[PDB]
Each structure stands twice: as C-alpha cells, then as structure tokens.
Ligand binder design. Sequence first.
Ligand SMILES: Nc1ncnc2c1ncn2[C@@H]1O[C@H](COP(=O)(O)OP(=O)(O)O)[C@@H](O)[C@H]1O
Ligand code: BEF
Ligand SMILES: [Mg+2]
Length: 743
Amino acid sequence: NPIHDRTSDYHKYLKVKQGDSDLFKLTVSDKRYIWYNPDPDERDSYECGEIVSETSDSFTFKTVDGQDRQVKKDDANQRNPIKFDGVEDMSELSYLNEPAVFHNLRVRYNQDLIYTYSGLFLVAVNPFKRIPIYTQEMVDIFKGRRRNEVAPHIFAISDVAYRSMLDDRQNQSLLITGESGAGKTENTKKVIQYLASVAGRNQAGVLEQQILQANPILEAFGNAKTTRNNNSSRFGKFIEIQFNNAGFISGASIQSYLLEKSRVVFQSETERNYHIFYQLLAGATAEEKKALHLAGPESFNYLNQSGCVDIKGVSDEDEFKITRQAMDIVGFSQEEQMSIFKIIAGILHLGNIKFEKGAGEGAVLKDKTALNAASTVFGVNPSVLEKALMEPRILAGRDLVAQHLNVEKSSSSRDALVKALYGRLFLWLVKKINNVLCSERAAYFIGVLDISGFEIFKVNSFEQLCINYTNEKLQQFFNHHMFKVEQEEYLKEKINLDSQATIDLIDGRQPPGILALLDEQSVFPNATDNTLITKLHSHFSKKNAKYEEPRFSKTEFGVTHYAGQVMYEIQDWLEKNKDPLQQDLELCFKDSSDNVVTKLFNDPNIASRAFITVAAQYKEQLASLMATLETTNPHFVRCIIPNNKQLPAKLEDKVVLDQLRCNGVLEGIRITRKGFPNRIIYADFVKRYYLLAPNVPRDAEDSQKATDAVLKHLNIDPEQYRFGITKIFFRAGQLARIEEARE
Ligand SMILES: Nc1ncnc2c1ncn2[C@@H]1O[C@H](COP(=O)(O)OP(=O)(O)O)[C@@H](O)[C@H]1O
Ligand code: BEF
Ligand SMILES: [Mg+2]
C-alpha cells in the first residue's frame, strides 16, 4: 500500500516526511512565541517573537532585532506549537490567527505541499512548476478513500463527491474559484480526469474520450494570453458530468458565461488575442493558407497591436494539431471545421478593412482587398457587405432610410460585427459539443464551476460588476451552507445578511437596483453615460449604505462588496447592455452560402438573447445556476496565486493574505475560532496525551474516561472543552496549552 509505504512517491510528494519516532518529547520546547509585525504599516508582514514575561494582562516579547516589546494578551497572535506546523487541515490549529494560518500554508508550500484543507475548503496554492501528483498511479490511490485517510488533493475531494453521489443518491457540485492565474482551470481538468477514470467504462471508451477532448476545443477559442496568465480563461463555465444509476459516466453538458468578446478587436500591451487566431496562422497547410488568404499575424490589425504574437514555450502550430484532433474526436466534420476556419479568417480580414473619408463626412472604401477576402470566406455579397457597413438603413419610425456613416461609426460597426460573429460562433461550438455529449436521461450529476472570484482592478467596468455580483451570490451560498453544516455537527455530537443588501442594490426590482436602472435607460436611444450615472446617484447617493458617490469623479460610483469597496466606471455601459448590431448586417449574413455562418444568423437560439438586455440575460443565467446549485451537495475549492510574478518557490505574504481575506477563508476561520474549533476523536487524544497524567494508558476502551482523566490531571477549565459523543471539543488555544504541558 503506497499509503503506508513511506518510501512511495505518494509519501514523498503529498506528505510531510515522518521520522522513526512519533514521541511527544521530540517536540518539547521551553520557548513560547508570538507573531509580530516588525513594521506596523506592513500589517501582513510578520516575524516571530519570543515571549520573555507576562503580566496578568499583557505579554512582553523579544524582537528579531533583540528589542523588547509588549502586547495585550487579547491582541496577541500566538504561534502554534511546532507539532502543528504542516497539519493537513487548518482546523486542527489551536491558535487561529492570520499569521498562524499563513504560516501553516507556508511550511506546507516549502515542501511543495500545495493542497491544504481549511474546514470545508480545499485550499490550492499554484506551484508554478510541475509536480508529478496527477498520474494514474495517483488516481488509483485516492479511489474510495475517506478525506482523513489521505492527503489533501483535488482527487480526494473529487472522490468524496462521487461516493456521496452514490451513497446519498444526491447530485453534487464543485466550485473552483480564485484570481486569474491561481490554478482554477488546472484543477478543473484534474476533476474531469479523475472522474473519467474512476467512473468510466473502459476495457482498453469513446464517450470518455470525447468528454476529455471538450475543454481543449473551448480553450482554443476562449483562452488568451494575458499579463496574468498565459492561458487565461476569458469565459466562465459550468460543467455537468452525467452518470447513470449504476455510477458510470453517461454524458456531459457545458454552460458558458460572459465571453470577453472585446478582446477579439483589441488587446492590452503584451497580451494576445484568442489562441485560435495564432494556431490557425501557424498550422494551416499551405493549401489552407491560400484558400483563406492567410498570412502572418503582423499582417493583421486584430493581431499586430499588442506587441506580442507568441507565448514562450508554446507552439501554436503544435497546439493547432491538438485542437484539430479534438474536433475530430468530438464529432466535427471536415466541412464544419473548414467553415469555423473561414470564419476565424474572415474576422481577420474584416479587421484589416480601412475606411477613409474626404468625400465629405461619409466613409469610403478606396481599397477593397480585405473586403473581398472576407466576403469570399464568409460566402456573402461584397457589395451588400459594403453597404451594410457604410450605409445601413435605419428606421425613423415611418421612414426606413439608409444613413451614410463616417469612418468612426463605420469602424465601430465593423467591430460590432466581428464581436457578434465571434460570440455567436462560440455559442455554436458549445451547443455542438452539447449535442454530442448531452444525455437527456441522466440519473445523477456532478457539476463543476470554473469561474473567477472577485475582480478588483484599477478600472472596473460592466463585466466586473457581473462577476462581482456572481461572487456575492456564491459567497452567500457558501455562508448558508457552512452554517447548516456546522449546526449539524454540533447536533450529531450533542454539544450546545450583509450579503443581501449588496445583492439587492444590484439586482433589486423595487426599489430598483443598479441593473434595473440600467435596463430602464436602455430603451432610450439618446440616453448617455451621464444620464445613467445621474440616475444612479439620484437613487443611491447618501440613500443606500452600500453605495458611494465619489467626491470628484463624475463617471464612477462605488459598491461595498463582500471583498471590499469597488469603484465602477460607467463609460459605454449603455452599449454594452444593448450589444447593438445593424440589421442590414444581420440581413447580409442571413444569405451566406456558408452552412455554419448561416446558422449563426438563422437560429434564434444563437442569434438572439431571448427583447432582453445583456444584464437581464445574465441575471437569468445566474439565477438558473444558483437554482441548480441549490439542489446539490456543494464542495468548495479556493485556488490561491502565490505571487504576481508567475514564479515558483516564492510565496508572498501580502499577496496571499489579501486573497485569503477576499475568498472567505479567513472569515470561516474567524467564525470557527469563535466556538470549539478543535474536535478530536477520544481515542486519538489518549494516544498522544496519555503520558501527561499519572494515571492513563495509551491503549484504552473507555477513551472518554481516559480523556477526562488527563483533563482532570492538568486541572483544565470545564468551559474550555465540551464532551462530544465521539469527539472532545476544544476551545481556541486550549489544545496548544495542553501540548505545552509536561510528561
Ligand atoms: N497544480 C498546478 N500544477 C502545475 N501548474 C499549475 C497548477 N495550477 C496552475 N498551474 C499553472 O499556472 C498557470 C495558470 O493556471 P490556470 O489553471 O490556467 O489558472 P486560472 O484558471 O485560475 O486563471 C497554468 O497554465 C499552469 O502553468
Ligand atoms: F486566468 Be484564469 F483562467 F482566471
Ligand atoms: Mg481558467
């Protein structure tokens, strides 16, 4: 058993190394320590101070410098006894303070132990290097083991979910959140690999392969290199792994949320557009290139503006293969693939269209190359296109009259088109995939959510509000859930909100919240950004406690979110909400000779939102998501980024701690710390502590009687612990004191 074979890779890579002895006296120490901030300005920066003396109410310790200081006992951040460094669950910690928590994570990370539990959560810190803990051999060790039986791992929470499903006949969910680059998508892919393996029907299976090939397809079209991650997911996703009554994988379905369409037409410096563009340019066959009027990235406006066309240690040509191979496995025909390619190319050509003026104020196409290129690949009438771009007919109530747009408006229109095409294509892909894997008649499911946690940038826009509104809801669900689950534990053992207000501000109908007001402004063609922001301040400024009207800025507003205050900039919200496309453009494309192209514009499912705004739509998708989640038994994973530099072996204190504060980890410890944080199995207590009392023997039947014995020996406050049917519950700091007692 690799599990009890101290020489196995399991032991080397997932466990804290065990020596020849386990004796209590090993860890004996005379010193006591306290975590302190050497600079009170740097609050997340701590050092360990050794305690020297104590008054009845305060502690006096020695700094690193050799300097002496004092602290109130009630404010002190005591350091846990060394026996606690590296524990697998932060819940076993006696002193539960911020520096203590950070420290356990750190001790673990130093030994490359990236996974740690924190009560209900599985905390996962990005290693930024490969650790061989995801092999088939690793998968087989985790099959059927209880949480406590094995080391923390994504595979373990995945197995727990699976056993619960079979045993309770209840659907399950895994929520994996955290910042960009924290490791969400990596862990998500591990869940799927694990499941496909433990629940798949292979004697060597097709379904299983298809399911596995699904994400690569989506990552090509929805991931991009950003400054925070070379493989950023520019969309949220919910994966439902479907099973039959017997527990075998039977299908799957995918839901996507919020694709960043704007990146297709603009990228920040150093970033890239979606991977596919590069993959196509790099691996199209010489025949494909000519058929697509293809060239180099440098030759395309949508690709030559960031200053970055490739990713280090990444071959777009080689990635292309992988992409195409997945499409093949999944079921896309050569034609369908072909058409996808034409679309991707066409978008590139549209991007090179240059509008010039002079005539007057109207726009003109002196050059017509690119137009022709795109026309061709799209299978549409170039002249129609031209006209639909520069001379859209607009409805003036009675009159349907074609407007002659200036270059700007003409450009912006082409851009809206590109965005419409890309976004529709992505939905088509997802629907396609779902058509192949989705089983109408599934018995049970395990759903995995891979989405960002709270987003707080310099500039926060409409997209960030959507994300933060999602996180307010997820966080609330977490809080409801932990509440029940702690309450249930106390019961089994026989021992003795703010969220809503922010949510209401956002999505309330009466009084109307932010989204309602935005939607209302959305029916007025002539409404502007000022109109809208004036309306928000009118309703909430000095009127809603979660809102803040800035002292000087006239284009922003603040929302107090769970993770802190966020300032939103209103620019372009109206447009974003309406996501407008000229009808003459829709007409142009409706007539495509291309089979997929046509679908993008003729299937209400892909072409239309429902008249629904973008906010309203989102609101609805969130509500269905939440509804499903509410029917599952949830599992929470929090992915943590170690630093903002993408480096291994560099766990930065402030970076980490900020994260732990935003994602709810610290609050749960806070909550937990309040009651009886430590809950030890009677038998286990005795094993270690029998020596402390001139009475008890390590091995006993009446473990409780034993436990009581020691407690009594040491003369411990009956308020410091509660007797449970199986566990002895301990208040914060108590266990540390015991550990601190002499043999
Ligand atoms: N457990 C891990 N082992 C190895 N590399 C990882 C791990 N977690 C994340 N990474 C790395 O960090 C990069 C960012 O991870 P990713 O899953 O894409 O983050 P997220 O989806 O949270 O934005 C990955 O492309 C990979 O290099
Ligand atoms: F960049 Be990660 F996908 F949030
Ligand atoms: Mg991702």
